[PDB]
Ligand binder design. Structure first.
Ligand code: EA4
Length: 164
C-alpha cells in the first residue's frame, strides 16, 4: 500500500521524537516516490541532516532544503524540479503534508506540515500525505517558529527513512 516514512527531529541537539508520514502514492505516486526516496537517501542525497528552516505558528512547519540549507534550494530525485502532479488532495487541517514551491511546477524537496487548515493553498501546492503519528513533535516544532518564519531553535531532521 501507501508508504510510511519517518523523520526523527532534534531541536538544539535534543531529540523531540518521530513524525510518521503516510505518503498518498495512490493519488500522487510521483510526488510520494520522490519524498520516500529522499527519506531513505538511496539516490545519494536526501533529508538526513537538513533543517526545518521556516516555521510560522498557526500555519505550518517547512523543511527539506538539503542543498542550500536556507530555503532557496533542494532538489528532487528526477532533477532540480518536477511538475505539479495534481491538486486532488486538499489542505483540510492540521497534519497535512504538502510540497513547498516557488510557483507552478517547481516542486523540489522542500515540504511543509500544516498546523491549521490552509485552504488558500488548495490548487497551488501539491498535498501528498499526512501525519500518522507525532503531531506532538509537529506542535513542539511550531512552538519554536515566529511570525517571520525564523526559528528560535536549530531544528534538524537527524534521521529519516521508510517504515513500509
Ligand atoms: C506554505 C509553503 O510556503 C511556501 O512554499 C513558500 N515558498 C517558498 O518557501 N519557496 C522557496 C522554494 C524554493 C524551491 C522549492 N523547490 C520550493 C520552495
Amino acid at each position: 500500500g501507501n508508504p510510511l516514512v519517518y523523520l526523527d527531529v532534534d531541536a538544539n541537539g535534543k531529540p523531540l521524537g518521530r513524525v510518521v508520514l503516510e505518503l498518498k502514492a495512490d493519488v500522487v505516486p510521483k510526488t510520494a516516490e520522490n519524498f520516500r526516496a529522499l527519506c531513505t537517501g538511496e539516490k545519494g542525497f536526501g533529508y538526513k541532516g537538513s533543517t526545518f528552516h521556516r516555521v510560522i505558528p498557526s500555519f505550518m512547519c517547512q523543511a527539506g532544503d538539503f542543498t542550500n540549507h536556507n530555503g532557496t534550494g533542494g532538489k528532487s530525485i528526477y532533477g532540480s524540479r518536477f511538475p505539479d502532479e495534481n491538486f486532488t488532495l486538499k489542505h483540510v487541517g492540521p497534519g497535512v503534508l504538502s510540497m513547498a514551491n516557488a510557483g507552478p511546477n517547481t516542486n523540489g524537496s522542500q515540504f511543509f506540515i500544516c498546523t491549521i487548515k490552509t485552504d488558500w493553498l488548495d490548487g497551488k501546492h501539491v498535498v501528498f500525505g499526512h501525519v500518522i503519528e507525532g503531531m506532538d513533535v509537529v506542535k513542539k516544532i511550531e512552538s519554536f517558529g515566529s511570525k517571520s518564519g525564523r526559528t528560535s531553535k536549530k531544528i534538524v531532521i537527524t534521521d529519516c527513512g521508510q517504515l513500509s
